[PDB]
Ligand binder design. Structure first.
Ligand SMILES: Cc1ccc(S(=O)(=O)NC(=O)NC2CCN(c3nccc(C(F)(F)F)n3)CC2)cc1
Ligand SMILES: Cc1ccc(S(=O)(=O)NC(=O)NC2CCN(c3nccc(C(F)(F)F)n3)CC2)cc1
Ligand SMILES: [Mg+2]
Lengths: 99, 99
């Protein structure tokens, strides 16, 4: 698709069997999805913000479908108020910014 | 331009006479630029993050040139570690996400 930006660029994703909504985020390095169970090993990781740090679980090579497009990458899972598709996955679905 | 996303989508901007680098950020509502003097009135505003809140100064109807493209909008100025062009300005330069 071609998505204008007058509202939050929210799309439907499919990850680990489930349907969720996620924000297409050119400002994020990494993809972060609210709490859920995913197959495979993971490793804890700390994400930094203005007041401090939040612990999440890094899973590698996860399959996710993003508005129809399949991709594979690292997904961080933890207590985020928004599901974010970061550049690690936007690159895998071929997304660009155009103006 | 058409910008791929393998690295941070950083562009040169021109605001208030000065050249700066800023991140094209589809995940931000608002544009936020590090400390500088701008003409006109402003009003304080609080931005929220994980550990708490950061005070910035909202200026309306500021001219900014973003990788060649002129736009006019609200710019928040304060102590941000990165210059962010949010959707309020990406909409004004006609930017879209495509995949
Ligand atoms: C103005 C401005 C924009 C962006 C940045 S940044 O340093 O480029 N980004 C950034 O700092 N984002 C943090 C915001 C809070 N966020 C978060 N909030 C709640 C929960 C979770 C977690 F860990 F579960 F995923 N994460 C973490 C990233 C700086 C200044
Ligand atoms: C995982 C995740 C991503 C994004 C969000 S969010 O709630 O969509 N975004 C967000 O929370 N961003 C905050 C990150 C820190 N940022 C900031 N950092 C330093 C300085 C300044 C200031 F005020 F000067 F501009 N701002 C504020 C925005 C949540 C979870
Ligand atoms: Mg962000």
């Amino acid at each position: 698709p071609q998505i204008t930006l007058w509202k939050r660029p929210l799309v439907t994703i499919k990850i680990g069997g489930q349907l969720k909504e996620a924000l297409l985020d050119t400002g994020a390095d990494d993809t972060v999805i609210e709490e859920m169970n995913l197959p495979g090993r993971w490793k804890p990781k700390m994400i930094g913000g203005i007041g401090g740090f939040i612990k999440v679980r890094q899973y590698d090579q996860i399959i996710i479908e993003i508005a129809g497009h399949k991709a594979i990458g690292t997904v961080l899972v933890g207590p985020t108020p928004v599901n974010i598709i970061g550049r690690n996955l936007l690159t895998q679905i071929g997304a660009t910014l155009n103006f």
